[PDB]
PDB file of C-alpha atoms (C1' of nucleotides) and ligand atoms in Angstrom:
ATOM      1  CA  UNK A  23       2.233  -2.598   7.322  1.00 31.31           C
ATOM      2  CA  UNK A  24       3.680  -5.781   6.280  1.00 31.57           C
ATOM      3  CA  UNK A  25       3.466  -6.692   2.019  1.00 35.85           C
ATOM      4  CA  UNK A  26       2.950  -9.523   1.097  1.00 33.65           C
ATOM      5  CA  UNK A  27       5.510 -11.905  -1.290  1.00 34.99           C
ATOM      6  CA  UNK A  28       2.837 -11.641  -3.511  1.00 34.77           C
ATOM      7  CA  UNK A  29       1.564 -10.378  -6.543  1.00 32.86           C
ATOM      8  CA  UNK A  30      -2.252 -10.668  -6.545  1.00 32.13           C
ATOM      9  CA  UNK A  31      -5.843  -9.423  -7.438  1.00 32.84           C
ATOM     10  CA  UNK A  32      -7.492  -7.793  -4.479  1.00 35.73           C
ATOM     11  CA  UNK A  33      -5.209  -6.914  -2.414  1.00 35.12           C
ATOM     12  CA  UNK A  34      -6.792  -6.072   1.163  1.00 35.25           C
ATOM     13  CA  UNK A  35      -2.792  -3.866   1.527  1.00 34.06           C
ATOM     14  CA  UNK A  36      -4.860  -0.793   0.966  1.00 32.51           C
ATOM     15  CA  UNK A  37      -7.625  -0.614   3.192  1.00 34.52           C
ATOM     16  CA  UNK A  38      -6.065  -2.135   6.012  1.00 35.53           C
ATOM     17  CA  UNK A  39      -6.991   0.784   7.638  1.00 35.88           C
ATOM     18  CA  UNK A  40     -10.490   0.143   7.963  1.00 35.63           C
ATOM     19  CA  UNK A  41     -10.357  -3.202   7.795  1.00 36.67           C
ATOM     20  CA  UNK A  42      -8.131  -3.798  11.568  1.00 37.82           C
ATOM     21  CA  UNK A  43     -10.827  -0.769  12.980  1.00 38.48           C
ATOM     22  CA  UNK A  44     -14.182  -2.637  12.238  1.00 37.97           C
ATOM     23  CA  UNK A  45     -12.501  -5.946  12.713  1.00 40.38           C
ATOM     24  CA  UNK A  46     -13.349  -7.823  16.837  1.00 43.72           C
ATOM     25  CA  UNK A  47     -10.930  -8.921  18.462  1.00 45.10           C
ATOM     26  CA  UNK A  48     -10.566 -13.006  19.339  1.00 46.08           C
ATOM     27  CA  UNK A  49      -8.838 -16.020  20.280  1.00 45.40           C
ATOM     28  CA  UNK A  50      -8.381 -16.894  16.578  1.00 41.37           C
ATOM     29  CA  UNK A  51      -9.260 -15.099  13.033  1.00 40.42           C
ATOM     30  CA  UNK A  52     -10.821 -17.482  10.555  1.00 38.73           C
ATOM     31  CA  UNK A  53     -10.079 -16.119   5.663  1.00 39.80           C
ATOM     32  CA  UNK A  54     -12.845 -18.815   4.587  1.00 42.00           C
ATOM     33  CA  UNK A  55     -10.399 -16.143   0.836  1.00 43.34           C
ATOM     34  CA  UNK A  56      -7.595 -15.308   2.766  1.00 42.46           C
ATOM     35  CA  UNK A  57      -5.911 -14.881  -1.048  1.00 41.81           C
ATOM     36  CA  UNK A  58      -2.325 -12.910  -0.806  1.00 42.83           C
ATOM     37  CA  UNK A  59      -2.960 -12.646   3.061  1.00 46.29           C
ATOM     38  CA  UNK A  60      -1.932  -9.139   3.996  1.00 45.38           C
ATOM     39  CA  UNK A  61      -5.113  -8.859   6.625  1.00 46.61           C
ATOM     40  CA  UNK A  62      -3.245 -12.311   8.314  1.00 45.12           C
ATOM     41  CA  UNK A  63       0.029 -10.207   7.484  1.00 48.21           C
ATOM     42  CA  UNK A  64      -0.603  -7.757   9.205  1.00 50.11           C
ATOM     43  CA  UNK A  65      -2.822  -8.594  13.054  1.00 46.35           C
ATOM     44  CA  UNK A  66      -1.634 -10.019  15.564  1.00 43.33           C
ATOM     45  CA  UNK A  67      -4.075 -13.282  16.317  1.00 42.61           C
ATOM     46  CA  UNK A  68      -3.487 -16.225  18.687  1.00 42.57           C
ATOM     47  CA  UNK A  69      -3.636 -18.365  16.300  1.00 40.85           C
ATOM     48  CA  UNK A  70      -5.565 -19.048  12.107  1.00 39.64           C
ATOM     49  CA  UNK A  71      -7.950 -20.888   9.900  1.00 38.90           C
ATOM     50  CA  UNK A  72      -6.604 -19.415   6.750  1.00 40.16           C
ATOM     51  CA  UNK A  73      -8.642 -21.193   3.276  1.00 39.45           C
ATOM     52  CA  UNK A  74      -8.502 -20.402  -0.322  1.00 40.01           C
ATOM     53  CA  UNK A  75     -10.226 -22.778  -3.119  1.00 36.79           C
ATOM     54  CA  UNK A  76      -6.880 -22.420  -5.094  1.00 34.93           C
ATOM     55  CA  UNK A  77      -4.917 -25.447  -3.920  1.00 37.65           C
ATOM     56  CA  UNK A  78      -2.100 -24.387  -6.260  1.00 37.23           C
ATOM     57  CA  UNK A  79      -1.500 -20.666  -3.497  1.00 33.87           C
ATOM     58  CA  UNK A  80      -2.383 -23.617  -0.272  1.00 31.43           C
ATOM     59  CA  UNK A  81      -0.027 -25.813  -1.459  1.00 30.12           C
ATOM     60  CA  UNK A  82       2.471 -22.855  -1.233  1.00 29.78           C
ATOM     61  CA  UNK A  83       1.995 -21.666   1.683  1.00 30.51           C
ATOM     62  CA  UNK A  84       2.285 -25.443   3.244  1.00 30.85           C
ATOM     63  CA  UNK A  85       5.454 -25.578   1.534  1.00 31.67           C
ATOM     64  CA  UNK A  86       7.461 -21.661   3.128  1.00 31.49           C
ATOM     65  CA  UNK A  87       5.817 -22.602   5.875  1.00 29.61           C
ATOM     66  CA  UNK A  88       7.518 -25.795   6.529  1.00 29.71           C
ATOM     67  CA  UNK A  89      10.689 -25.688   4.299  1.00 31.38           C
ATOM     68  CA  UNK A  90      11.334 -22.033   4.613  1.00 31.77           C
ATOM     69  CA  UNK A  91      15.455 -22.169   4.835  1.00 32.52           C
ATOM     70  CA  UNK A  92      14.955 -24.622   1.283  1.00 29.81           C
ATOM     71  CA  UNK A  93      12.037 -23.549  -0.870  1.00 33.39           C
ATOM     72  CA  UNK A  94      13.688 -19.734   0.179  1.00 35.10           C
ATOM     73  CA  UNK A  95      17.349 -20.407  -1.462  1.00 31.08           C
ATOM     74  CA  UNK A  96      15.449 -22.851  -4.397  1.00 31.87           C
ATOM     75  CA  UNK A  97      13.081 -19.564  -5.030  1.00 31.47           C
ATOM     76  CA  UNK A  98      15.481 -17.517  -5.440  1.00 30.88           C
ATOM     77  CA  UNK A  99      17.397 -18.816  -7.952  1.00 31.06           C
ATOM     78  CA  UNK A 100      14.991 -18.309 -10.323  1.00 30.62           C
ATOM     79  CA  UNK A 101      14.907 -14.285  -9.852  1.00 30.51           C
ATOM     80  CA  UNK A 102      18.772 -13.822 -12.135  1.00 31.08           C
ATOM     81  CA  UNK A 103      18.629 -11.613 -14.506  1.00 30.33           C
ATOM     82  CA  UNK A 104      18.857 -14.557 -17.211  1.00 31.23           C
ATOM     83  CA  UNK A 105      15.072 -15.607 -16.626  1.00 33.57           C
ATOM     84  CA  UNK A 106      13.600 -12.473 -17.059  1.00 32.52           C
ATOM     85  CA  UNK A 107      12.840 -13.162 -21.219  1.00 36.16           C
ATOM     86  CA  UNK A 108       9.534 -14.499 -22.820  1.00 35.04           C
ATOM     87  CA  UNK A 109      11.846 -17.990 -24.056  1.00 35.98           C
ATOM     88  CA  UNK A 110      12.891 -18.490 -20.538  1.00 35.95           C
ATOM     89  CA  UNK A 111       9.468 -17.787 -19.044  1.00 35.24           C
ATOM     90  CA  UNK A 112       7.594 -20.384 -20.590  1.00 32.08           C
ATOM     91  CA  UNK A 113      10.041 -23.343 -20.855  1.00 30.74           C
ATOM     92  CA  UNK A 114       9.189 -22.916 -16.848  1.00 33.42           C
ATOM     93  CA  UNK A 115       5.410 -21.873 -16.983  1.00 28.41           C
ATOM     94  CA  UNK A 116       4.955 -25.389 -18.743  1.00 29.59           C
ATOM     95  CA  UNK A 117       6.790 -27.467 -15.991  1.00 28.30           C
ATOM     96  CA  UNK A 118       4.942 -25.050 -13.738  1.00 27.67           C
ATOM     97  CA  UNK A 119       1.755 -27.122 -15.202  1.00 29.12           C
ATOM     98  CA  UNK A 120       3.829 -30.479 -16.264  1.00 29.34           C
ATOM     99  CA  UNK A 121       5.344 -30.226 -12.312  1.00 27.56           C
ATOM    100  CA  UNK A 122       3.574 -32.923 -10.365  1.00 23.87           C
ATOM    101  CA  UNK A 123       5.968 -31.999  -7.188  1.00 25.48           C
ATOM    102  CA  UNK A 124       4.254 -29.522  -4.562  1.00 23.85           C
ATOM    103  CA  UNK A 125       7.834 -27.961  -4.011  1.00 25.00           C
ATOM    104  CA  UNK A 126       8.741 -27.483  -7.451  1.00 26.49           C
ATOM    105  CA  UNK A 127       4.951 -26.300  -7.741  1.00 25.79           C
ATOM    106  CA  UNK A 128       6.188 -23.407  -5.385  1.00 22.84           C
ATOM    107  CA  UNK A 129       8.911 -22.805  -6.120  1.00 20.89           C
ATOM    108  CA  UNK A 130       7.802 -21.735 -10.165  1.00 22.75           C
ATOM    109  CA  UNK A 131       4.300 -20.715  -8.458  1.00 22.55           C
ATOM    110  CA  UNK A 132       7.033 -17.221  -7.271  1.00 24.82           C
ATOM    111  CA  UNK A 133       8.708 -17.055 -10.637  1.00 22.37           C
ATOM    112  CA  UNK A 134       5.335 -16.451 -12.209  1.00 23.14           C
ATOM    113  CA  UNK A 135       3.641 -14.684 -10.247  1.00 22.61           C
ATOM    114  CA  UNK A 136       6.847 -11.800 -10.157  1.00 26.10           C
ATOM    115  CA  UNK A 137       7.374 -12.108 -13.851  1.00 29.37           C
ATOM    116  CA  UNK A 138       3.398 -12.821 -15.383  1.00 30.82           C
ATOM    117  CA  UNK A 139       1.683 -10.213 -17.443  1.00 31.38           C
ATOM    118  CA  UNK A 140      -0.339  -7.898 -14.410  1.00 36.24           C
ATOM    119  CA  UNK A 141       1.007 -10.408 -11.367  1.00 38.51           C
ATOM    120  CA  UNK A 142      -2.609 -11.790 -13.082  1.00 40.20           C
ATOM    121  CA  UNK A 143      -3.311 -16.084 -12.089  1.00 42.28           C
ATOM    122  CA  UNK A 144      -5.553 -17.504 -15.274  1.00 41.93           C
ATOM    123  CA  UNK A 145      -5.747 -21.084 -15.816  1.00 44.29           C
ATOM    124  CA  UNK A 146      -7.950 -23.038 -17.863  1.00 45.53           C
ATOM    125  CA  UNK A 147      -9.749 -25.502 -18.019  1.00 46.62           C
ATOM    126  CA  UNK A 148      -7.162 -28.522 -17.577  1.00 45.64           C
ATOM    127  CA  UNK A 149      -5.550 -26.707 -15.025  1.00 46.42           C
ATOM    128  CA  UNK A 150      -2.720 -25.088 -16.198  1.00 45.09           C
ATOM    129  CA  UNK A 151      -1.304 -21.953 -15.738  1.00 43.57           C
ATOM    130  CA  UNK A 152      -1.846 -19.633 -19.181  1.00 47.72           C
ATOM    131  CA  UNK A 153      -0.671 -16.480 -17.921  1.00 48.60           C
ATOM    132  CA  UNK A 154       1.868 -14.824 -20.671  1.00 48.50           C
ATOM    133  CA  UNK A 155       5.033 -13.154 -19.857  1.00 48.29           C
ATOM    134  CA  UNK A 156       5.201  -9.817 -18.174  1.00 45.67           C
ATOM    135  CA  UNK A 157       8.110  -8.077 -19.010  1.00 45.83           C
ATOM    136  CA  UNK A 158       8.964  -5.649 -16.664  1.00 46.60           C
ATOM    137  CA  UNK A 159      11.906  -3.876 -16.105  1.00 44.57           C
ATOM    138  CA  UNK A 160      13.332  -6.471 -12.902  1.00 44.96           C
ATOM    139  CA  UNK A 161      10.680  -8.477 -10.784  1.00 42.39           C
ATOM    140  CA  UNK A 162      11.874  -7.678  -6.992  1.00 40.39           C
ATOM    141  CA  UNK A 163      12.091 -11.315  -4.854  1.00 39.90           C
ATOM    142  CA  UNK A 164      10.262 -11.219  -2.209  1.00 40.58           C
ATOM    143  CA  UNK A 165      12.838 -12.678   0.347  1.00 41.06           C
ATOM    144  CA  UNK A 166      11.503 -10.847   3.787  1.00 42.54           C
ATOM    145  CA  UNK A 167       8.105 -10.208   3.327  1.00 48.04           C
ATOM    146  CA  UNK A 168       8.291 -14.990   3.091  1.00 49.34           C
ATOM    147  CA  UNK A 169      10.359 -15.596   5.420  1.00 49.59           C
ATOM    148  CA  UNK A 170       7.867 -12.808   7.989  1.00 52.92           C
ATOM    149  CA  UNK A 171       5.031 -15.670   6.411  1.00 53.37           C
ATOM    150  CA  UNK A 172       6.745 -18.404   7.022  1.00 53.17           C
ATOM    151  CA  UNK A 173       7.028 -16.845  10.296  1.00 52.58           C
ATOM    152  CA  UNK A 174       3.676 -15.641  10.605  1.00 52.83           C
ATOM    153  CA  UNK A 175       3.027 -19.452   9.383  1.00 53.40           C
ATOM    154  CA  UNK A 176       3.368 -20.705  12.584  1.00 55.59           C
ATOM    155  CA  UNK A 177       0.497 -20.232  14.375  1.00 54.62           C
ATOM    156  CA  UNK A 178      -1.392 -20.700  10.999  1.00 55.51           C
ATOM    157  CA  UNK A 179      -3.277 -23.675   9.458  1.00 56.97           C
ATOM    158  CA  UNK A 180      -3.257 -23.933   5.623  1.00 57.37           C
ATOM    159  CA  UNK A 181      -7.034 -25.438   3.993  1.00 59.45           C
ATOM    160  CA  UNK A 182      -7.788 -26.129   0.236  1.00 59.25           C
ATOM    161  CA  UNK A 183     -11.454 -25.781   0.792  1.00 58.08           C
ATOM    162  CA  UNK A 184     -14.765 -23.002  -0.433  1.00 57.21           C
ATOM    163  CA  UNK A 185     -16.340 -20.506   1.336  1.00 59.84           C
ATOM    164  CA  UNK A 186     -19.350 -22.883   3.154  1.00 63.55           C
ATOM    165  CA  UNK A 187     -16.130 -25.614   4.717  1.00 60.91           C
ATOM    166  CA  UNK A 188     -14.337 -23.025   5.927  1.00 61.05           C
ATOM    167  CA  UNK A 189     -16.308 -20.830   7.687  1.00 62.27           C
ATOM    168  CA  UNK A 190     -17.687 -23.668   9.647  1.00 61.37           C
ATOM    169  CA  UNK A 191     -14.335 -24.282  10.994  1.00 61.54           C
ATOM    170  CA  UNK A 192     -14.922 -20.961  12.737  1.00 64.82           C
ATOM    171  CA  UNK A 193     -15.418 -20.894  17.394  1.00 64.08           C
ATOM    172  CA  UNK A 194     -16.672 -19.345  19.804  1.00 60.75           C
ATOM    173  CA  UNK A 195     -12.989 -18.060  20.399  1.00 60.91           C
ATOM    174  CA  UNK A 196     -12.784 -17.403  16.516  1.00 61.81           C
ATOM    175  CA  UNK A 197     -13.543 -14.356  14.231  1.00 63.77           C
ATOM    176  CA  UNK A 198     -14.011 -14.731  10.625  1.00 63.12           C
ATOM    177  CA  UNK A 199     -13.347 -11.392   8.399  1.00 63.75           C
ATOM    178  CA  UNK A 200     -14.673 -12.984   4.997  1.00 62.42           C
ATOM    179  CA  UNK A 201     -13.325 -11.015   1.398  1.00 59.66           C
ATOM    180  CA  UNK A 202     -15.441 -12.657  -1.426  1.00 60.67           C
ATOM    181  CA  UNK A 203     -13.704 -11.662  -5.714  1.00 59.57           C
ATOM    182  CA  UNK A 204     -16.054  -8.173  -6.542  1.00 57.61           C
ATOM    183  CA  UNK A 205     -19.610  -7.550  -6.660  1.00 56.89           C
ATOM    184  CA  UNK A 206     -19.822  -6.637 -10.099  1.00 59.37           C
ATOM    185  CA  UNK A 207     -20.831  -2.749 -10.593  1.00 55.86           C
ATOM    186  CA  UNK A 208     -22.944  -3.470 -13.584  1.00 56.42           C
ATOM    187  CA  UNK A 218     -18.536 -20.035 -17.162  1.00 59.07           C
ATOM    188  CA  UNK A 219     -16.147 -19.835 -13.489  1.00 55.09           C
ATOM    189  CA  UNK A 220     -16.400 -16.957 -11.883  1.00 53.80           C
ATOM    190  CA  UNK A 221     -18.067 -16.345  -8.248  1.00 48.40           C
ATOM    191  CA  UNK A 222     -21.416 -16.644  -8.649  1.00 47.40           C
ATOM    192  CA  UNK A 223     -24.707 -13.828  -6.774  1.00 48.83           C
ATOM    193  CA  UNK A 224     -26.056 -16.803  -5.633  1.00 49.78           C
ATOM    194  CA  UNK A 225     -22.611 -16.969  -3.745  1.00 51.31           C
ATOM    195  CA  UNK A 226     -22.873 -14.025  -3.001  1.00 50.24           C
ATOM    196  CA  UNK A 227     -26.408 -13.724  -0.966  1.00 49.15           C
ATOM    197  CA  UNK A 228     -24.907 -17.463   0.660  1.00 47.72           C
ATOM    198  CA  UNK A 229     -21.747 -15.943   2.174  1.00 48.19           C
ATOM    199  CA  UNK A 230     -24.127 -12.837   3.694  1.00 51.06           C
ATOM    200  CA  UNK A 231     -26.625 -15.989   5.141  1.00 51.53           C
ATOM    201  CA  UNK A 232     -23.305 -17.864   6.695  1.00 50.54           C
ATOM    202  CA  UNK A 233     -22.669 -15.192   7.770  1.00 55.36           C
ATOM    203  CA  UNK A 234     -25.817 -15.029   9.460  1.00 52.60           C
ATOM    204  CA  UNK A 235     -25.989 -18.047  11.106  1.00 53.77           C
ATOM    205  CA  UNK A 236     -22.555 -17.672  12.406  1.00 56.48           C
ATOM    206  CA  UNK A 237     -23.548 -14.299  14.313  1.00 60.05           C
ATOM    207  CA  UNK A 238     -26.161 -15.947  15.852  1.00 58.78           C
ATOM    208  CA  UNK A 239     -24.113 -18.458  17.472  1.00 62.35           C
ATOM    209  CA  UNK A 240     -22.077 -15.373  19.027  1.00 61.12           C
ATOM    210  CA  UNK A 241     -19.393 -15.667  15.586  1.00 61.17           C
ATOM    211  CA  UNK A 242     -18.651 -12.150  14.521  1.00 62.40           C
ATOM    212  CA  UNK A 243     -17.461 -11.591  11.348  1.00 60.01           C
ATOM    213  CA  UNK A 244     -16.318  -8.883   8.877  1.00 57.62           C
ATOM    214  CA  UNK A 245     -17.000  -8.814   4.803  1.00 59.62           C
ATOM    215  CA  UNK A 246     -15.734  -6.757   2.681  1.00 59.71           C
ATOM    216  CA  UNK A 247     -17.005  -5.568  -1.080  1.00 60.19           C
ATOM    217  CA  UNK A 248     -17.623  -3.359  -3.377  1.00 56.98           C
ATOM    218  CA  UNK A 249     -20.538  -0.802  -2.820  1.00 55.79           C
ATOM    219  CA  UNK A 250     -23.697  -1.318  -4.802  1.00 56.57           C
ATOM    220  CA  UNK A 251     -27.386  -1.852  -4.852  1.00 56.51           C
ATOM    221  CA  UNK A 252     -26.580  -5.875  -4.140  1.00 52.87           C
ATOM    222  CA  UNK A 253     -23.899  -5.779  -1.826  1.00 48.71           C
ATOM    223  CA  UNK A 254     -26.310  -3.098   0.302  1.00 51.28           C
ATOM    224  CA  UNK A 255     -29.116  -6.216   0.436  1.00 53.83           C
ATOM    225  CA  UNK A 256     -27.195  -8.883   0.427  1.00 53.96           C
ATOM    226  CA  UNK A 257     -25.602  -7.368   3.765  1.00 56.15           C
ATOM    227  CA  UNK A 258     -28.991  -5.971   5.007  1.00 55.43           C
ATOM    228  CA  UNK A 259     -28.177  -7.208   8.398  1.00 55.54           C
ATOM    229  CA  UNK A 260     -25.112  -5.839   8.985  1.00 56.87           C
ATOM    230  CA  UNK A 261     -23.573  -2.146   9.994  1.00 57.52           C
ATOM    231  CA  UNK A 262     -22.391  -0.779   7.119  1.00 57.53           C
ATOM    232  CA  UNK A 263     -19.612   1.097   7.035  1.00 55.78           C
ATOM    233  CA  UNK A 264     -18.104   3.402   4.202  1.00 56.12           C
ATOM    234  CA  UNK A 265     -15.230   3.062   2.612  1.00 54.90           C
ATOM    235  CA  UNK A 266     -14.563   5.996   0.387  1.00 55.25           C
ATOM    236  CA  UNK A 267     -11.471   5.211  -1.731  1.00 54.54           C
ATOM    237  CA  UNK A 268     -13.511   6.313  -5.511  1.00 51.50           C
ATOM    238  CA  UNK A 269     -11.365   5.034  -7.782  1.00 52.35           C
ATOM    239  CA  UNK A 278     -16.013   6.549 -15.535  1.00 55.44           C
ATOM    240  CA  UNK A 279     -17.671   5.628 -12.528  1.00 51.56           C
ATOM    241  CA  UNK A 280     -16.536   6.151  -8.754  1.00 52.18           C
ATOM    242  CA  UNK A 281     -16.844   3.175  -6.005  1.00 52.95           C
ATOM    243  CA  UNK A 282     -16.606   3.259  -3.111  1.00 52.04           C
ATOM    244  CA  UNK A 283     -15.770  -0.177  -0.442  1.00 51.31           C
ATOM    245  CA  UNK A 284     -18.232  -1.414   2.633  1.00 51.79           C
ATOM    246  CA  UNK A 285     -17.615  -2.735   5.334  1.00 51.12           C
ATOM    247  CA  UNK A 286     -20.226  -5.228   6.968  1.00 48.55           C
ATOM    248  CA  UNK A 287     -19.662  -6.093   9.884  1.00 52.12           C
ATOM    249  CA  UNK A 288     -21.930  -8.709  12.156  1.00 51.37           C
ATOM    250  CA  UNK A 289     -21.862  -7.987  16.092  1.00 53.00           C
ATOM    251  CA  UNK A 290     -23.434 -10.932  18.298  1.00 50.65           C
TER     252      UNK A 290
ATOM    253  C1'  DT J   1     -10.887  -3.402 -20.225  1.00 53.03           C
ATOM    254  C1'  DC J   2      -9.978  -7.414 -25.454  1.00 55.53           C
ATOM    255  C1'  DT J   3     -10.359 -10.372 -29.635  1.00 56.56           C
ATOM    256  C1'  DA J   4      -8.593 -14.865 -34.090  1.00 58.06           C
ATOM    257  C1'  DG J   5      -9.223 -19.158 -33.444  1.00 61.60           C
ATOM    258  C1'  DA J   6     -10.707 -23.348 -31.900  1.00 61.10           C
ATOM    259  C1'  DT J   7     -14.550 -25.857 -29.467  1.00 58.55           C
ATOM    260  C1'  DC J   8     -19.327 -26.491 -27.083  1.00 59.01           C
ATOM    261  C1'  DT J   9     -24.038 -27.576 -27.665  1.00 59.48           C
ATOM    262  C1'  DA J  10     -28.211 -27.840 -29.205  1.00 54.21           C
ATOM    263  C1'  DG J  11     -31.811 -27.869 -33.193  1.00 55.33           C
ATOM    264  C1'  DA J  12     -33.674 -35.110 -33.750  1.00 56.11           C
TER     265       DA J  12
ATOM    266  C1'  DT P   1     -22.646 -34.117 -41.574  1.00 53.40           C
ATOM    267  C1'  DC P   2     -24.088 -27.403 -40.948  1.00 55.80           C
ATOM    268  C1'  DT P   3     -23.400 -24.169 -37.441  1.00 55.45           C
ATOM    269  C1'  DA P   4     -25.157 -20.151 -35.090  1.00 53.52           C
ATOM    270  C1'  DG P   5     -24.743 -17.937 -30.898  1.00 52.77           C
ATOM    271  C1'  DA P   6     -21.994 -18.594 -27.263  1.00 50.19           C
ATOM    272  C1'  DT P   7     -17.789 -20.258 -24.698  1.00 47.94           C
ATOM    273  C1'  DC P   8     -12.990 -21.717 -23.819  1.00 47.14           C
ATOM    274  C1'  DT P   9      -8.201 -20.127 -25.021  1.00 48.92           C
ATOM    275  C1'  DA P  10      -3.933 -16.916 -24.522  1.00 49.07           C
ATOM    276  C1'  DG P  11      -1.173 -13.032 -25.992  1.00 49.15           C
ATOM    277  C1'  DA P  12       2.724 -16.677 -30.805  1.00 47.95           C
TER     278       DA P  12
HETATM  279  N1  SFG Z 301     -15.721 -20.184  -3.813  1.00 44.31           N
HETATM  280  C1  SFG Z 301     -14.488 -19.692  -2.992  1.00 44.31           C
HETATM  281  N2  SFG Z 301     -14.257 -20.340  -1.517  1.00 44.31           N
HETATM  282  C2  SFG Z 301     -12.745 -19.928  -1.016  1.00 44.31           C
HETATM  283  N3  SFG Z 301     -12.202 -18.497  -1.588  1.00 44.31           N
HETATM  284  C3  SFG Z 301     -12.127 -18.931  -3.110  1.00 44.31           C
HETATM  285  C4  SFG Z 301     -13.311 -18.624  -3.790  1.00 44.31           C
HETATM  286  N4  SFG Z 301     -13.950 -18.515  -5.343  1.00 44.31           N
HETATM  287  C5  SFG Z 301     -12.759 -17.885  -5.201  1.00 44.31           C
HETATM  288  N5  SFG Z 301     -12.302 -18.094  -3.873  1.00 44.31           N
HETATM  289  C6  SFG Z 301      -9.921 -16.967  -3.701  1.00 44.31           C
HETATM  290  O1  SFG Z 301     -10.694 -15.773  -3.119  1.00 44.31           O
HETATM  291  C7  SFG Z 301     -10.162 -14.306  -2.858  1.00 44.31           C
HETATM  292  C8  SFG Z 301      -9.743 -13.404  -2.915  1.00 44.31           C
HETATM  293  C9  SFG Z 301      -9.303 -12.462  -2.701  1.00 44.31           C
HETATM  294  N6  SFG Z 301      -9.744 -11.518  -3.386  1.00 44.31           N
HETATM  295  C10 SFG Z 301      -9.254 -12.832  -1.617  1.00 44.31           C
HETATM  296  C11 SFG Z 301      -7.599 -11.312  -1.403  1.00 44.31           C
HETATM  297  C12 SFG Z 301      -7.161 -11.381   0.164  1.00 44.31           C
HETATM  298  N7  SFG Z 301      -8.327 -10.345   0.973  1.00 44.31           N
HETATM  299  C13 SFG Z 301      -5.598 -10.385  -0.186  1.00 44.31           C
HETATM  300  O2  SFG Z 301      -5.612  -9.866   0.654  1.00 44.31           O
HETATM  301  O3  SFG Z 301      -4.601 -10.784  -0.800  1.00 44.31           O
HETATM  302  C14 SFG Z 301      -9.687 -15.371  -4.097  1.00 44.31           C
HETATM  303  O4  SFG Z 301      -7.797 -15.636  -4.064  1.00 44.31           O
HETATM  304  C15 SFG Z 301      -9.715 -16.840  -4.543  1.00 44.31           C
HETATM  305  O5  SFG Z 301      -9.486 -17.844  -5.436  1.00 44.31           O
END
DNA sequence: TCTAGATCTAGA
DNA sequence: TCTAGATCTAGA
């Protein structure tokens, strides 16, 4: 099992067993919500189309892929004992938000992700990263995970676009895995309309003989959205207990 | 999961 | 010129 080099919300590292068994085979894997890319790092497709709405994330991935050794050496400088304090963190955060250089931003982005509070990724409406200091004892520099990512990235294209645009790139030799933001159990958030729209696009792709796999919480709403797919309940219970749902659209 | 402080939006 | 109610900000 390969780990992502980024802390990221909704990481599918724990559920990789259930995903890979229910994920159809193909020449290309399309991830509209790639995030940290746990599935991409733990599968073996000939090529990938990885997309996300986060421009900083996609920019980082392009840098790591194209300028690997240069990035690792630069990013390694920031993972020293002297940088693990609030005053240094907040200046680096400010440097990140004021930087117009993709490389420097990518370098700082990794630091902020590993030194920031709970590994959060949060922006204000000005597009400024505003996650406070994390106060970790010893942040880990994912050098091994970085090189493995860049190695696998050689067969992947990265795009900063919404799910509708990325799924439109899917061909007949493609498989689509969708990991959208979690549906609510009970602004800027991923809306219920978008949750329903995702299933609708999934219905269109399978009608075009393109396999689509979707993962989400197991709720009454998700069962309604994915009612045209074979439903597979994963028990990772985690005051109520929440199961996960794998919705497969097989042609 | 929170919340004090600042800002937004409408009532013509 | 208010400001209730709802967002937004960011951990200071
Ligand atoms: N409309 C959108 N279109 C495409 N991606 C989005 C959209 N909204 C949110 N996202 C991204 O979808 C991702 C959701 C993550 N939970 C995915 C995690 C990913 N599966 C991983 O293993 O790391 C986030 O990175 C979002 O930035």
